[PDB]
Amino acid sequence: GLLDGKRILVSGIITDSSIAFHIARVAQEQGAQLVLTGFDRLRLIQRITDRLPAKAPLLELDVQNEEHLASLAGRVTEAIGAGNKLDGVVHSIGFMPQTGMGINPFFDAPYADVSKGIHISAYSYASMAKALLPIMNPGGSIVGMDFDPSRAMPAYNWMTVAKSALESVNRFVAREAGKYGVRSNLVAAGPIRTLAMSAIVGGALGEEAGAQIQLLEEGWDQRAPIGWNMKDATPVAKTVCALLSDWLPATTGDIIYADGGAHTQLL
Amino acid sequence: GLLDGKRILVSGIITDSSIAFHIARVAQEQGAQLVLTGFDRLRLIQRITDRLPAKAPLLELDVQNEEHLASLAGRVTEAIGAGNKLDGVVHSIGFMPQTGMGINPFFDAPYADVSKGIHISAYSYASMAKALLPIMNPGGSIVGMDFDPSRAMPAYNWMTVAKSALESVNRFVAREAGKYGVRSNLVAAGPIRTLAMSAIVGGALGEEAGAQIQLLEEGWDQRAPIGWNMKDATPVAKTVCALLSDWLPATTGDIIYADGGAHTQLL
Amino acid sequence: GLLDGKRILVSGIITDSSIAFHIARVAQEQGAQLVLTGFDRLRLIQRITDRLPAKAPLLELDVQNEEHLASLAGRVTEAIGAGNKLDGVVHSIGFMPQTGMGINPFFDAPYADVSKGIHISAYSYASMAKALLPIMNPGGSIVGMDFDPSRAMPAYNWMTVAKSALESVNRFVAREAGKYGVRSNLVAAGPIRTLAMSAIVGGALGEEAGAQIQLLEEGWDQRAPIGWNMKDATPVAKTVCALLSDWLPATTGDIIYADGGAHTQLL
Amino acid sequence: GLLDGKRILVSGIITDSSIAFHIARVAQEQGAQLVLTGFDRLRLIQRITDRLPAKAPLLELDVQNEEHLASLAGRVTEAIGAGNKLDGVVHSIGFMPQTGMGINPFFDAPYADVSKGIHISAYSYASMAKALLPIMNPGGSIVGMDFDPSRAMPAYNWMTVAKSALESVNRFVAREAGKYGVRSNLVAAGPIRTLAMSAIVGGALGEEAGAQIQLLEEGWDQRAPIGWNMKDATPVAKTVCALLSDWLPATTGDIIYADGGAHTQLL
Numbered sequence A, B, C, D: 001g002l003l004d005g006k007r008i009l010v011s012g013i014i015t016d017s018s019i020a021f022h023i024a025r026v027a028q029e030q031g032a033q034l035v036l037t038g039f040d041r042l043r044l045i046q047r048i049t050d051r052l053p054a055k056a057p058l059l060e061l062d063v064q065n066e067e068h069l070a071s072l073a074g075r076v077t078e079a080i081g082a083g084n085k086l087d088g089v090v091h092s093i094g095f096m097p098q099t100g101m102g103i104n105p106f107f108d109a110p111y112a113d114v115s116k117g118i119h120i121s122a123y124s125y126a127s128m129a130k131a132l133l134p135i136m137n138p139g140g141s142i143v144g145m146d147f148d149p150s151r152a153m154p155a156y157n158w159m160t161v162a163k164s165a166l167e168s169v170n171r172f173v174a175r176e177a178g179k180y181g182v183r184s185n186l187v188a189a190g191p192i193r194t195l196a197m198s199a200i201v202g203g204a205l206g207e208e209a210g211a212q213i214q215l216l217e218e219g220w221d222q223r224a225p226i227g228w229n230m231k232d233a234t235p236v237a238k239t240v241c242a243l244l245s246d247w248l249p250a251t252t253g254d255i256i257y258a259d260g261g262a263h264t265q266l267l
């Protein structure tokens, strides 16, 4: 297996469509011993994760909760056994109130909402790193889920801003991570039809935003030289695993594009 | 004059070393009729602005204050006279608590501090745009002060993250601004020895951070093909005015580097 | 005038639709004393340039001709009068054989053709700089015409490669230029319907390439927050003049986008 | 093994210090069945490649020779056996005459020399792709060796320009490659002390260029969060193999930085 004998912490599972669910599945297929972290609906995350190729301890983590982060390292160690450390940390956490995404005009998102979104979607990449780096082995790897925010786009609005902030956070996490011999990087993925994304397209955040995001998401497979199948997280999950492996040993504070090459193409 | 008959709102003056003080001065030398906005210490801002080539009404603006922003357009109109609009808006506002910059480890900045910093340094670019765009003329221009955050650097820490967020904000402000026939852009300046910057170099945010920033700032004049004089904001102030003028009519959601070309050079 | 008392060399005029014809016109409207350089069809360039707001000496320059480049400085001095130097140099020169652009598959362009294209479109930016920098004044400016090649696009093929090379050349010209106190920069313009571009759209380099370029060119005005009118070089010509002026004094080895902001927008 | 049952063509071996020698070695350690291509000194390349973990047929390829490229696919098929195709193609070919690199002023490189350099270092990435894509399997991979040319640097001069051109070429090769279900990407490596690089540092292309390149190369390990050991190609060779594998399935027309993260850091 690619990740044989590796202890990897995988955050972000909420449904069977979560990118993290596919990251977890592939890493287990590649021999990783995982520890999962869930938020709020833990009875659901447990039931969802029962479908993973193997059993993995589930720990609760609200990245906005300062006690959860402080108690994280200890709780992780209790699950993996004393004397054992993590080799991989996967941040697949993202959130933005409806004021920040969708139909709501960009100027109408109040700061308290944008702040909540940058805390969960960007600051938490450094929060997780702080907590987990003392219990990470040299050669270890932190991977975060990004969406290319280099250019503005319709509807994605403040969530775009949170991604720009996260790409900056990552470059700084890399500086700290490196002192522990650990790499920190992001995977900028093409659009993936998660339950939330599907709802949006179906008009959950308004019709105008839904049409904008359906058009936006169709432009990937057109630009992408090798195509883009938005109903398939496996190519994304495989890239995350390439970064958790020992095959990208000189890459840190960087972004790897699992987007079918669509970002390299104008038309 | 370059800005002849132009009504430009200039925010950010605090001392005679402020980049905004030099933006104000050059714009007045180029024939602009200005309206200034100050924060907290208004008796000081008035006394400092008495040294500008001409008189300009000073209005109070705490970008974190929702009433100031709501009352802004009306107060600006009262100063410029009803029936008159703004042609230019200058955002030269930035702030980050000491936990976010300096010696304090990157992981030790609490979110409430980083959030305060992203609100004042990034979100406020959209707050100002919202307020002022209804009272801006077609062909108008919004300019913001940026510091190239494309790569991580010592000590600048979370303020780097706030700049990355601001560059993203700008791309989105441009989308809204354009509906009013107004351009929105940033000027990524090289280091300028303001009173605050000088204090930092002198050890205000710790010795380690001071040495890092002195080294950092000396690398500009070495990389820069035309040199970089950090004791001179005039080249920066001139670039801001080029963007307020009618000579960059097809540039929006963009960054203009007034850094001596140092960003284009490795060594 | 913006360029009052400035002596600017303007290359690239071939027809009344040439970007250089509009650069020349605006610079003359802004008070510049110009020297023009033409290639091959000089009787035509003279007749075309008779329509400029003022008279300007026309000099012959085949950038592939080593004698023309060697004799350039002397011939320029003879036209502007001994003791006088240039303040501005405009490179608006570009060429790629049909094998390199259009319908012809990318793999089917022979090297001798691509080489001819990189010589005229990229290397010549350094050739012109070499020749003209000894007869340029401190504070002077070299400006070149670019087309954003950051991402691949249909039909533009090897001409894209020549632009990528030119952006690299510029960064290096800036290093040499700076020793003379002169800035070197490029203007990455949005598509302009020149006679050549119109012919292409009309099927001159094949129907498939024509349709690709018409689609490509229509995407500018859709992405561009302030719009993009491809039948109007005036916004481009104005930007070139902003770089020839004294209002961008700290910008070198850089690119300024006169594209309506379309490069900053995904959709 | 990572590359188990994969047939990979590896170009660029000249000495035991060649990046390609290490790409070959790692790919063989990971189970790849290789075909090597050499230039000019084939008796030497054979003797050097005798030290590879396994035997691999050596084929002659002067990328400037149109017959070699035409006969390539047939010769490769004869070596791997009819009915068998390539899964991987490694371009580790680069060259620039002394006029283009080193002490020689940037303006003093004649075009015939720069052209020779862009042909071998950039155009040949498309030449190899053309030749080998008809004999490549779906899921296949083309990898090229890049050196980050985003910013100008001392001494590297026209070779920088050739890299900028190659990054553009790659984005276009990706468009063609994709029709065959094949990915095309580059690895932008940090400096590697090959025999040629060592000679340069030792004054082979002049003392001024040698000092510039020694200083340049020392800046990597300082910027790089995880460090940079220039006497070790193994991290580079491992990254090339990650791209030849099935673990980066949604990455094409892209660049992967095996530079210790030094490009993500200012200081």
Ligand SMILES: NC(=O)c1ccc[n+]([C@@H]2O[C@H](COP(=O)([O-])OP(=O)(O)OC[C@H]3O[C@@H](n4cnc5c(N)ncnc54)[C@H](O)[C@@H]3O)[C@@H](O)[C@H]2O)c1
Residues within 6 Å of the ligand: A011, A012, A013, A014, A015, A017, A018, A019, A020, A038, A039, A061, A062, A063, A064, A092, A093, A094, A095, A120, A145, A146, A147, A188, A189, A190, A191, A192, A193, A194, A196, A197
């Ligand atoms: N879906 C796409 O099109 C797409 C594309 C590229 C990147 N991404 C990114 O991938 C990541 C995963 O998103 P996804 O699309 O799989 O959706 P998702 O809904 O399945 O995952 C997001 C996760 O964030 C968790 N979360 C929210 N608030 C939290 C908090 N306070 N503390 C801890 N966890 C919290 C949720 O429980 C959920 O598990 C996100 O960063 C997203 O921005 C998504």
Ligand SMILES: NC(=O)c1ccc[n+]([C@@H]2O[C@H](COP(=O)([O-])OP(=O)(O)OC[C@H]3O[C@@H](n4cnc5c(N)ncnc54)[C@H](O)[C@@H]3O)[C@@H](O)[C@H]2O)c1
Residues within 6 Å of the ligand: B011, B012, B013, B014, B015, B017, B018, B019, B020, B038, B039, B061, B062, B063, B064, B092, B093, B094, B095, B120, B145, B146, B147, B188, B189, B190, B191, B192, B193, B194, B196, B197
């Ligand atoms: N000094 C440098 O080296 C440098 C270089 C490039 C860019 N910049 C940027 O230029 C801008 C101006 O900075 P400066 O260096 O002239 O320093 P400065 O201290 O003179 O200006 C910053 C201004 O922000 C104002 N401000 C702070 N909090 C505010 C709030 N809540 N509401 C309204 N105004 C508020 C302050 O009153 C001050 O006038 C900033 O965005 C800064 O990041 C600075």
Ligand SMILES: NC(=O)c1ccc[n+]([C@@H]2O[C@H](COP(=O)([O-])OP(=O)(O)OC[C@H]3O[C@@H](n4cnc5c(N)ncnc54)[C@H](O)[C@@H]3O)[C@@H](O)[C@H]2O)c1
Residues within 6 Å of the ligand: C011, C012, C013, C014, C015, C017, C018, C019, C020, C038, C039, C061, C062, C063, C064, C092, C093, C094, C095, C120, C145, C146, C147, C188, C189, C190, C191, C192, C193, C194, C196, C197
């Ligand atoms: N038209 C567009 O859509 C567009 C957009 C952005 C940038 N550009 C760039 O702007 C520049 C000017 O192009 P244009 O669109 O005005 O077309 P153009 O045909 O009017 O100008 C190109 C010029 O190159 C000259 N030239 C060709 N070979 C030469 C040689 N060997 N020596 C000297 N001069 C030579 C021609 O005489 C002509 O004057 C080019 O660099 C082009 O790539 C064009």
Ligand SMILES: NC(=O)c1ccc[n+]([C@@H]2O[C@H](COP(=O)([O-])OP(=O)(O)OC[C@H]3O[C@@H](n4cnc5c(N)ncnc54)[C@H](O)[C@@H]3O)[C@@H](O)[C@H]2O)c1
Residues within 6 Å of the ligand: D011, D012, D013, D014, D015, D017, D018, D019, D020, D038, D039, D061, D062, D063, D064, D092, D093, D094, D095, D120, D145, D146, D147, D188, D189, D190, D191, D192, D193, D194, D196, D197
């Ligand atoms: N050494 C570094 O610091 C460094 C860093 C990053 C990238 N690179 C790149 O890696 C690649 C390999 O370089 P290297 O450093 O291992 O040096 P190298 O000398 O070992 O390899 C270059 C190869 O190019 C071959 N070659 C030259 N002309 C040729 C032609 N006409 N046809 C076919 N092959 C030809 C040579 O035989 C040699 O095998 C190059 O593209 C180089 O630019 C080098």
Ligand SMILES: O=C(NCc1cccnc1)NC1CCCCC1
Residues within 6 Å of the ligand: A094, A095, A096, A147, A156, A159, A190, A191, A192, A196, A197, A213, A216, A217
């Ligand atoms: O980042 C996300 N999607 C990327 C995207 C953007 C535009 C179009 N298509 C996809 N989604 C996240 C939003 C916050 C909750 C977790 C999921």
Ligand SMILES: O=C(NCc1cccnc1)NC1CCCCC1
Residues within 6 Å of the ligand: B094, B095, B096, B147, B156, B159, B190, B191, B192, B196, B197, B213, B216, B217
């Ligand atoms: O952005 C600022 N400085 C840029 C910089 C960074 C690193 C080195 N030298 C300069 N300063 C601002 C900080 C917040 C209060 C206003 C000023």
Ligand SMILES: O=C(NCc1cccnc1)NC1CCCCC1
Residues within 6 Å of the ligand: C094, C095, C096, C147, C156, C159, C190, C191, C192, C196, C197, C213, C216, C217
């Ligand atoms: O650079 C040029 N056009 C840019 C462009 C690309 C794609 C679509 N629309 C416009 N044209 C030049 C070609 C060589 C002769 C001079 C003109």
Ligand SMILES: O=C(NCc1cccnc1)NC1CCCCC1
Residues within 6 Å of the ligand: D094, D095, D096, D147, D156, D159, D190, D191, D192, D196, D197, D213, D216, D217
């Ligand atoms: O690309 C190469 N080196 C990268 C580099 C640049 C600057 C400093 N250190 C390293 N070298 C190649 C030159 C042409 C022959 C093959 C090797």
